[PDB]
């Protein structure tokens, strides 16, 4: 219950 723009960084983090 708290959406954010961390999906973009996750693509960069998870991809890291």
UniProtKB/Swiss-Prot annotation:
Taxonomy, superkingdom: Eukaryota
Places the protein is found? Secreted, Extracellular space, Surface film
Described purpose of this protein according to its UniProt entry: Pulmonary surfactant-associated proteins promote alveolar stability by lowering the surface tension at the air-liquid interface in the peripheral air spaces. SP-B increases the collapse pressure of palmitic acid to nearly 70 millinewtons per meter.
Supply any other comment.
Pulmonary surfactant consists of 90% lipid and 10% protein. There are 4 surfactant-associated proteins: 2 collagenous, carbohydrate-binding glycoproteins (SP-A and SP-D) and 2 small hydrophobic proteins (SP-B and SP-C).
Q: What pathology does the entry list? A: Pulmonary surfactant metabolism dysfunction 1: A rare lung disorder due to impaired surfactant homeostasis. It is characterized by alveolar filling with floccular material that stains positive using the periodic acid-Schiff method and is derived from surfactant phospholipids and protein components. Excessive lipoproteins accumulation in the alveoli results in severe respiratory distress.
The record describes its quaternary structure and partners as:
Homodimer; disulfide-linked.
- Under which name does UniProt file this protein? Pulmonary surfactant-associated protein B
Upper classification of the source organism reads: Eukaryota, Metazoa, Chordata, Craniata, Vertebrata
């Amino acid at each position: 219950g708290r959406m954010l723009p961390q999906l973009v960084c996750r693509l960069v983090l998870r991809c890291s």
